[PDB]
Symmetry: D2
Subunit: 249 residues, 4 copies
């Protein structure tokens, strides 16, 4: 019987590449999305064309709210409903934008940035564990958490909280044989809205090849961590950053 | 004219020792409290008896909510109203209790209290402190054991990790304004009032330096250092005051 | 056509498992050894029986001395002599024993062996590897417990900390040459042959994930990942393979 | 009776400021030096003019060698011989220069100097310090805030500073039962090299978030004073960055 995986924010970019590579490795996949319905379904169609009834989609807002716990339980439930099991959770979905300390409401920014990057991963982790082989969770972290971008304090707080969850959950779920690890990109796929001149500025800072990581290169580290080659690995965060985090000002 | 400081959760325990030591150093203090009204007022009375018009209390819930930004703004405003200035912010108030991943507060409430008090309220207080602006600084009460967490304390731990992030992010962003942002990270300090002596001794005996918990005063000493002129080039730093506990393997 | 790898201290235990797994992946291997001549030759025989002309041995003391640079150059040279190329360096060889700060090897010798094997020899091998230059990479065997050190192992610990520094420094400096530099950091893996069973069990039961030590093969798996095309964007990274041990408080 | 401190490399720059501030705090001081005899003696004369019989000098090469253990024992011994006690050790002396991985000191000499001064000599001094105790005893190691964002081609220097972090932590743990605390102070940009042109100095200064300037030697010394004080009696194994936020700045 084929294992099954949930990937949050899987319709595009890094999450899409993760879903594709898990599917290629033999997983059935839940493609979670928020706004990207068309791209989510398009991906599921591609995967189901390769192997029938191996991909489903699942819609949810992961902003923090009174309903978030129910939404996260339903994401996990969607995997059990479609595939009868849930072996892997990848927490990939993430809101990302500046929140300057000195001059959406700030309460909404808190809900979106801390909800997507930290609280929803926590609630999904709870629901994943409650419903339980090579079981594991992979959190998409950020190699630059300790050298943060100016005016991104709430985003950064969210990613730091995710490191804490990764470590806390590794410890607490180890007795259940659930491993919990992270993958920490530096510069990967740049924002669609960023101008080419700015993209090049960031690319040229990367020591290894002066370019961003492809989505597939991020996905490769995820595949490693969920594999039998990582069966003793828990609580670990692998940087996939081409040396960027080691570069001084 | 005397500088002024806000200390959150200052009615008791470590926050009280911090407020007392800042007061002894010449600061006027806002004693923030949530439920500990009697202890807060009693402390302000003691400090004002020592020097008139040098302490006020300020009540606020720092649970996450849509009104938390306004509450945090009002804490800072309370310092300006009492003293005409706000030089130092100490983020000390903190909810602390287990939230097991596997099995009667709702999880919505646990998130709001643990992430609100330990991370979001510090962020909003930091915003308000900075907006309203000399030796200006913020000191966050962190946790030396954030990377060796207590079993079943994931939300608390997430909160303290987020506070590290804030410490670093805010140091960077507020450096141009001359505001320093640092942390003090206890290991074992004052044990919970409800904990039995047998358990207290179990944790005390794990500490390499002296096999005892830190006094509240020892924590406060590190805060006093970081707000002083002796730390004027220090920002983004988190000083462990843990007697070596974080270095001890399983 | 086949790439080639040097593995230091490869005659036994973790280094042997690394050499075997690299060989199984298609590498030709130099089996470096110091005292374990019989085991090194036996391993080369086993690998060459599987595929002819794919393994040689190379003897060297990696204690620090004025001749260590020449010895390390000769290890790399041995790879070029046997295989015409050198694609991968695994710095595995390591002296490990206590050096109490407060009280028949001299301290001069303890320094030379512990700092030589764990740090200086890796540095010199890295220099020689780089000078003599595709998927080129170095993997250093680090230690997940470097910040929760064993009592009385200060020189060993200093050595492993230095190796972290080298991993990061060399990643940065060799990135323009397309050489990646990464580490694998065990917690409890293969226990010392000389350790009593009662002590072995004490350490095993501290590991959160499965209450057992890592097999040599599990360590090797992380090395195989880091040298593979699946890690082509990874440099300066140290992967813990410790079953959660480093996260456990005292 | 006044406590006593050893400060290595104390004739100039940061070590000098540390020795001065310890002296001002009431310590008697051993001023260790290697080549800077005239500056060491000049400092001792200034301190003894302030308070008689409160400063001596002690000469030693801290390069790694067969004699280094004996040299480090003798440094500690010189404190006991002058002052009858040794309360504080500050490991400050440090060689600093590039050692590129890819291309007239030999590399074995570079190893001996960079690893000796930054790591091995601190270890041996720590051993000797602890052996002679066998009251507020503490060691402060001068570390480096930028150890995880290293300067290109400074691999041996960086290895040395990483080793010193290890020592700080290992020694804190092992000496805690004796009541000896072990901590570090980690500068970012402090006193720039004497040779450096103002244009290059300003390049590095302008990277510092807090004030766009290097730390004074006195600012570094202030952190040392804190760590040896009664205000840090529960602090051990801690490394305080004094870097104006530099270590938090991305590329
Ligand atoms: N790209 C980089 O360079 C980089 C660098 C460091 C770390 N990372 C991390 O790597 C991961 C993937 O990065 P990425 O660039 O591929 O991400 P992204 O494109 O910014 O976000 C991925 C998806 O997150 C979903 N998401 C956002 N807000 C949401 C909400 N309120 N509720 C539910 N889902 C929500 C969106 O799904 P819909 O489109 O369906 O609305 C979006 O497509 C993230 O965790 C990121 O922080 C990336
Ligand atoms: N004690 C230790 O061993 C230790 C260890 C590591 C870190 N620390 C950190 O050091 C700091 C002080 O520790 P502590 O033991 O003195 O703290 P504490 O006694 O547990 O709590 C401090 C105060 O926080 C306030 N607080 C709690 N929930 C609040 C809410 N919803 N809104 C507003 N205020 C709220 C309470 O004020 P009221 O009483 O007024 O309701 C309480 O007296 C904390 O940040 C803690 O995490 C302490
Ligand atoms: N085992 C664990 O639990 C563990 C934990 C943390 C980290 N690690 C790291 O993982 C690596 C492998 O561990 P291990 O237990 O397999 O190692 P080990 O058995 O303790 O040592 C590996 C080899 O190092 C060689 N070596 C020692 N002194 C040498 C010298 N002066 N010159 C040259 N080679 C020398 C020896 O080779 P000969 O036999 O040929 O004399 C020895 O066989 C090491 O770097 C270790 O620090 C292991
Ligand atoms: N300056 C900075 O920006 C900076 C930045 C980060 C960290 N730090 C650390 O802070 C400390 C002080 O820095 P600094 O710039 O003041 O130091 P420095 O001037 O480069 O060196 C201080 C002293 O070290 C001594 N020393 C060098 N090689 C020696 C050897 N072989 N044996 C014995 N002593 C030797 C020299 O003594 P003699 O003059 O008597 O020969 C020298 O005056 C160092 O540990 C340094 O790594 C400094
Ligand atoms: C200030 C800045 O952009 N660059 C620094 C590092 C340097 C040099 C930095 O903080 N970085 C971290 C974030 C990276 C970009 O990221 C993302 C890019 C695009 C989408 C995206 N989505 C989500 N959800 N999260 C993130 N982090 C990103 C660039 C380097
Ligand atoms: C499971 C556990 O306690 N583990 C270690 C104990 C040891 C040794 C640990 O992880 N520690 C972290 C938490 C410390 C205790 O704390 C507090 C104690 C009392 C009140 C309190 N209030 C608040 N707000 N926060 C905290 N952290 C604490 C003990 C060491
Ligand atoms: C004091 C102690 O061992 N404490 C923990 C043990 C636990 C839990 C610890 O610090 N660990 C580090 C040392 C590990 C053992 O290691 C080795 C074991 C066998 C051989 C060996 N060779 C070499 N070269 N290096 C090392 N590190 C080891 C156990 C976990
Ligand atoms: C390449 C580089 O310098 N990069 C940054 C500078 C910036 C921003 C860096 O890595 N830093 C570390 C080294 C600092 C300079 O230092 C010294 C300067 C002068 C003397 C000296 N002596 C000794 N013994 N050690 C050191 N480290 C220094 C600059 C910041």
């Amino acid at each position: 019987e084929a294992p099954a995986a949930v990937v949050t924010g899987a319709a595009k970019r890094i999450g899409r590449a993760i879903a594709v590579k898990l599917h290629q490795t033999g997983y059935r996949v839940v493609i979670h999305y928020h706004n990207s319905a068309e791209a989510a379904v398009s991906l599921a169609d591609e995967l189901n064309k390769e192997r029938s009834n191996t991909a489903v989609v699942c819609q949810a807002d992961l902003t923090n709210s009174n309903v978030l716990p129910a939404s996260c339980e339903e994401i996990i439930n969607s995997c059990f409903r479609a595939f009868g099991r849930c072996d892997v959770l990848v927490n990939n979905a993430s809101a990302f934008y500046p929140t300057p300390l000195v001059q959406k409401t700030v309460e909404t920014q808190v809900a979106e940035l801390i909800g997507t990057n930290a609280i929803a991963p926590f609630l999904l982790t709870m629901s994943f564990a409650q419903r339980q082989s090579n079981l594991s969770i992979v959190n998409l972290c950020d190699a630059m958490v300790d050298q943060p971008c100016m005016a991104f304090s709430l985003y950064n707080m969210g990613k730091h909280a995710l490191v804490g969850l990764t470590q806390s959950a590794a410890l607490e779920l180890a007795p259940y044989g659930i491993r919990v690890n992270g993958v920490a990109p530096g510069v990967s796929l740049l924002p669609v809205a960023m101008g080419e001149e700015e993209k090049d500025k960031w690319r040229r800072k990367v020591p290894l090849g002066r370019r961003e990581a492809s989505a597939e290169q991020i996905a490769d580290a995820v595949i490693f961590l969920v594999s039998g080659s990582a069966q003793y690995i828990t609580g670990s965060i692998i940087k996939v950053d081409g040396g960027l985090s080691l570069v001084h000002a």
